[PDB]
Amino acid sequence: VSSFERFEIFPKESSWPNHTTTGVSASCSHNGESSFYKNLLWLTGKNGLYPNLS
Amino acid sequence: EVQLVQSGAEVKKPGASVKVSCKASGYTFTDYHINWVRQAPGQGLEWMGWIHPNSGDTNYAQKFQGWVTMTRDTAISTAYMEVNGLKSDDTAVYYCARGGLEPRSVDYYYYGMD
Ligand SMILES: *[C@@H]1O[C@H](CO)[C@@H](O)[C@H](O)[C@H]1NC(C)=O
Ligand SMILES: *[C@@H]1O[C@H](CO)[C@@H](O)[C@H](O)[C@H]1NC(C)=O
C-alpha cells in the first residue's frame, strides 16, 4: 500500500440512535473480559425494537 | 424504587376467565419485559411468558399458547394476564416480573427477571 488511513465511517454514537451498539462476545475477549472487533459494531434491539435502518 | 403491584385475589368456577393486572412504578415502563410466572400450591415456579410493553411483542410458553392472552396499556403503566377456560389445576399464585437484568453478552442475550 502506498497510503493508508483508518477513519471512523460510522461513529459509535450519532450513527445508531435507535439501536444498541454495546454488543460483545466472550469469543473476542480482551483481558479475560468479553469484547468485540474494534472496526465493527454489533447492532441489536433497543427497547424491544430493531427499527429498519438505512 | 422499582415496584410491581398486582390486582387482588380471585375466586372462579371452572370455565370462567380472569384478567390479572400488574402496575409498575419506579422505572420507564416501556424499557423492559413483563414476565408472567405462576406457582401452584406446594409446587415450584412455572414460567408462562413475557410481553414487551414498548413493541407489544409476546412470547408464550407452549403449555399456555392459546389459553392465555398477555396485553399492556402503557398509558397507566400496566400489563394484563387474561386466562380462559379455567380448571381446578389452574388454581395457583400468579406473579409478574420485570425483565431488567440486561444481558452482558450476545451469547446468552436474555433479559433476566429483576
Ligand atoms: C430514531 O427515532 C426517532 C424517533 O422520533 C426519529 O426521530 C429518528 O429519525 C430515528 N433515527 C433513525 C436513525 O432511525
Ligand atoms: C419496516 O418495514 C416493514 C415492511 O413495510 C414494516 O412492516 C415495519 O413496520 C417497518 N419498521 C419500521 C420501524 O419502520
Domain ranges for chain B: 1-114
- Measured between alpha carbons, how far is B52 from B79 in angstroms, rounded to an integer? 9
- Measured between alpha carbons, how far is B6 from A51 in angstroms, rounded to an integer? 32
- Measured between alpha carbons, how far is A30 from B23 in angstroms, rounded to an integer? 42
Q: How does A6-15 read in b/e, with b if 16+ C-beta sit within 10 Å?
A: eeeeeeeeee
Total Cβ atoms within 10 A of residue A40: 8
Residue B98's DSSP bridge partners are B34
Distance from CA of B71 to the nearest CA of A (A): 15
Closest atom, ligand 1, to C-alpha of A16: 13
Q: Determine the CATH number of domain B1-114.
A: 2.60.40.10
Reduced 3-state DSSP string for chain B: CCEEEECCCCCCCCCCCEEEEEEEECCCCCCCEEEEEEECCCCCEEEEEEECCCCCCEEECCCCCCCEEEEECCCCCEEEEEECCCCHHHCCEEEEEEECECCCCCCCCCCECC
- Measured between alpha carbons, how far is B27 from B50 in angstroms, rounded to an integer? 18
- Point out the ligand nearest to the CA of residue A17: 1
